[model samples]
Target chain A: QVGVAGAVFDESTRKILVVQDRNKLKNMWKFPGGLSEPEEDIGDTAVREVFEETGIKSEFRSVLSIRQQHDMYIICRLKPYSFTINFCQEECLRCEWMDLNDLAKTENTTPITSRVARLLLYGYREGFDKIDLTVEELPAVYTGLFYKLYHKELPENYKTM
Target chain B: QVGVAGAVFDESTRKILVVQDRNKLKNMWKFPGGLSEPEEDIGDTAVREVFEETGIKSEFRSVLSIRQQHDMYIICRLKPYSFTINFCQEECLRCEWMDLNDLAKTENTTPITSRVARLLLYGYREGFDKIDLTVEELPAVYTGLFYKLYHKELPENYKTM
Candidate 1:
């Protein structure tokens, strides 16, 4: 299974969005995400999952990380388009826009959640260019088809030569 | 269908490996790869396809690009462990270690091939850190399972805090 996670950021408030699973025992704090549907794009999955789990509209920005085990999980950084939290009560115990500073140190979250939270902080404090693996959609060999490429954002000079 | 390609490079020789399909109409030169098997890891798929199509053993270094249409195609940068060119005659028309410079401008290659060729040259001339989304293996919450993480290499200071 290919999973997708969205670390939605409200840059104005310097906060990150998170959720807790209603079905889990510990219900550790984590990003809002779910599995990719058949033939779905990576960014599409991230955006859809965030919307489905939180009822918050967001736009995909860049991929923050990828976790590959028996299943491959992609974590993407997103910018929120709408701020009001209307979370899915059937699936979530709690959902909120938590301060980035607290998330990085919170023991209540999963290791990956905390690690990415710290990464979000790094991006927030320094610059997103330092932490983002930005996406570019390029034309594929097959006519009328394109692909999403995720890599370090290239410098302007490097883009041509 | 999810696919993977290996851009195997011999940094010492300043050469990148490529192949042409046996069944294609144009048989244009491109990286050697194929569709991933069920439940297969991305790096594993890339290594397997390269060996199968070109008989070249290589180690996965980082992802160079991804093409997304109805099917997702992942391209990975690789380092050759063995310098051999025993290609699969049934699947490949030609396979060789071509110079990176030639690959970047060659019209005989696919757009993705040329694009990634240029990206590789950027890595070669500048630094791989500028182009690579490096991989890291981390433990999963599921006991006895580990996950492969791919992201931009972080600065030492940024990694700690």
Candidate 2:
């Protein structure tokens, strides 16, 4: 199963949306996200999951990190469009826009959560370009098809010779 | 189908491995790769396909790019272990360790092929850390399981608060 999580940010507040799962063996705070449906793109899964769990609408920016156990789990950076909290009652026990500084030091979250929180803190302070794997859509060899290439954003000089 | 390609580099000689398909409607100079099997990791598929198509053994380093159309196609950076060319004739028309300079400017290649070639040149001239989306293995939320996280290599100061 492939899972995707969103680190949706309210840039002004310096806060990120997070949730607690209702029925886990040991539920902990984590990003609002879920499994990817068949043929769903990574960013699409992230945007959908954030909206489904927390009422915040967001736009996918770039992939922050990817987790690959037996299954693939991805985390993406998102810019929130709506701020109202209307979280799903069935899936989430608690949901809030917590400050990134708090999330970075909090102990009541998963390992990746803490790790990403610190990573996000770095991005917030040093500019996201330092930590982001930005995406670009390019034409594929197969006509009529295109693919998203995610990597560190290149300087204008590096795009070509 | 999910596809993975390897841009295997012979760092010592500044040459990159490339292949031409045996049967394609329009064959061009491209990296050697193929569709991934269910449950296979991105780097695993890259390592496997490169060996199957070109007899060179390599170590998976980092993901260079990812293409997302209806399907996901990933490109990874690899370091070659064996140099002798023992390519599979059934699948490859020609295989060689082409110079990055020629590949970057050559028109007989896909859009991505040329783009990645230039990216490779940048990495070759500057430093790979500037272009590589490096991988790290960390324990997952699930007990006894681990996940690979691919992102830009963080500075030592950024790993923690």
Candidate 3:
């Protein structure tokens, strides 16, 4: 299934909301987001995921990026309501707000999330150049697809999740 | 995971787009829609699935209904760009633009789809009511949680896919 992630920022503090996902399948320290339920709007998915993980209501703003590692990825910009951080034990082990330097240096966040932080630090210049998608091709990065083409079986480490 | 389905109608022709899923897990004749993917927007999920399965590019209009029976069900209104329907061998056994009256009476369409057709016949009074969700509960359903609750192991029937 396609999953979603959002970089929810508190513009006042110049900080972004982030969480360390505890689930085995998603053991990552990253911006808070997850899969979209069927028929949910992408905007709704981003807003709902941020609130569910962090206890912060948010409004999704724009598409930051899209990737597909055999599954779809949609990264968007978010406007978070408050500074209070609450990590739900069900999905996250840690939740906090971070500045650009902290997010860039943190080893805990996933590769894609690190990229998102970098994009933000650059003041959204990446988005100013709107992505042009080809008509026949899917409008997402085919991440891991080439490798998965030959590697049919799950890796031993990943199988544990 | 949460699944999305939508009925696209051309008001003048009164025809609707529908497809039959080839996967055993979703071997049903229904309106064009499918399970949401990781990092995928729910809106994109519905649109992408339709194009991939039936070769019809669709514009998602709005939510029609939401049902949570362990797994969440979402119905949406769709505006298909055109009438061309090409059934993909990988995902569909059939694809067609059926007349509204024919679709409503046909058993080939799944029960949920039949309900959608009836709603369309009455011109979206179902939409006028809209949906109400809890603040604690996110707007969209978390699709896999309940299924993972009892059947962490997928049924042998669905596992093959």
- Candidate 1 lDDT, tens digit per residue, B1-161? 46899999888999999998888734578998889898777899999999998988999988887564545677899999998889999988889999998888777887778878888988898888777875656665637677666676666675566
Off by over 4 Å in 3: A25-28, A124-161, B1-161
Q: Clashing residue pairs, candidate 2?
A: A147-B68, A148-B68
Cα RMSD over interface residues, candidate 2: 3.0
lDDT of each: 0.81, 0.83, 0.57
Is candidate 1 or 2 superior in TM-score?
2
lDDT of 1: 0.81
TM-score attained by chain A of model 1: 0.87
lDDT, candidate 3, at A33:
75
Q: Taking chain A by itself, what TM-score does each prediction score?
A: 0.87, 0.86, 0.71
DockQ of all candidates, in order? 0.39, 0.49, 0.02
Query: Which structure is stronger by TM-score: 1 or 3?
Result: 1
lDDT of 2 by residue, B1-161 (tens): 46789999988999999998888723589998888898777789999999999999998988887665545567899999999989999988999999989898888998888888888888888888778886667776647787667777767675665
lDDT of 3 by residue, A53-160 (tens): 888888876555544332445666788776677768888877878776578666665555655565565543323222111101111121322111100112223212
Per model, kept true contacts as a fraction are 0.54, 0.77, 0.00
Greater DockQ among 1 and 2 belongs to 2
